[PDB]
């Protein structure tokens, strides 16, 4: 139903080891579709999903010119930010940006995003109104004044409400067989004795897409949030994701525990138990 497009840019300095590396990746939901890396033998925009391969040579050349221009802009920006923070020329620093649009189930713009971070900390972000900025500190206020003079927020608003949504809808149509297909999780409960008094019940969810899922354990109908070990959702390597939740339970009490799974690909939410 709901879809998003995002570009993720990362630039990292490496004094004594050449110019800063710039990498850009593009995603529709949890599917990467493009990559650009300034460190590649021949830097160019490359396809990463089959549905993008039909875009013409004009698309690939235009994207490459944009990413090559960003490579130079980000290199200049890393020098600027080293100055704003009175940093020495010896250390390595990172500048990251993420931007894009979110559509609701009807295909309309839900909201736009444009945020940046320096050394993994929030630096400047375009507010939800797409007309003002939130600067994290006095260094980011310098960038904010520069961007106010160049009318950046107006230009980003035009992109986010226009071209961003239009390209996202085109990608969703061209990739409809995968982008618009939710794969439900294959679920099961495994049992692993810990000792004579306890056993682990592990609830598995495998092969699902998109990554968003809810996996919870209940004991006598009450959520077990504090006692559940919930692993981070992880990629399988074939577009799908995996996750598990485990609880350590007293021996003989396994039937008081239920695993609950919520996911977009499911006809109805699941309730599972250990089936000996």
């Amino acid at each position: 139903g709901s879809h998003s497009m995002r570009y993720f840019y990362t630039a990292m300095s490496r004094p004594g080891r050449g110019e800063p590396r710039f990498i850009a990746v593009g995603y529709v939901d949890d599917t990467q579709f493009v990559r650009f890396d300034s460190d590649a033998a021949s830097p160019r925009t490359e396809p990463r999903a089959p549905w993008i391969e039909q875009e013409g040579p004009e698309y690939w050349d235009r994207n490459t010119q944009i990413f090559k221009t960003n490579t130079q802009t980000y290199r200049e920006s890393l020098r600027n930010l080293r100055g704003y923070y009175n940093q020495s020329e010896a250390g390595s620093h990172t500048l990251q940006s993420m931007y894009g649009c979110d559509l609701g189930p009807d295909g309309r713009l839900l909201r736009g995003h444009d945020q940046s971070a320096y050394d993994g900390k929030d630096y400047i972000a375009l507010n939800e109104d797409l007309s003002s900025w939130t600067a994290a500190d006095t260094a980011a206020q310098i960038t904010q004044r520069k961007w106010e003079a160049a009318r950046v927020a107006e230009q980003l608003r035009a992109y986010l409400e226009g071209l961003c949504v239009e390209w996202l809808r085109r990608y969703l149509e061209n990739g409809k067989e995968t982008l618009q297909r939710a794969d439900p999780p294959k679920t099961h409960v495994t049992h692993h004795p810990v000792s004579d008094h306890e056993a682990t019940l592990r609830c598995w969810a495998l092969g699902f897409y998109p990554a968003e899922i809810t996996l919870t354990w209940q004991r006598d109908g009450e959520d077990q949030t504090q006692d559940t070990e919930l692993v981070e959702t992880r990629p399988a390597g074939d577009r799908t994701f995996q996750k598990w939740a485990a609880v350590v339970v007293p021996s003989g009490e396994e039937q008081r525990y239920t695993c609950h799974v919520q996911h977009e690909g499911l006809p109805k939410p699941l309730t599972l138990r250990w089936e000996p």
């Binding site: 570009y7 990413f67 960003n70 802009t73 920006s77 600027n80 630096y123 520069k146 390209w167």
Partner: peptide, 9 residues
């Protein structure tokens, strides 16, 4: 497709 709103920080 990426934006072309490119400015130094």
């Amino acid at each position: 497709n990426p934006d072309i709103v490119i400015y130094q920080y």
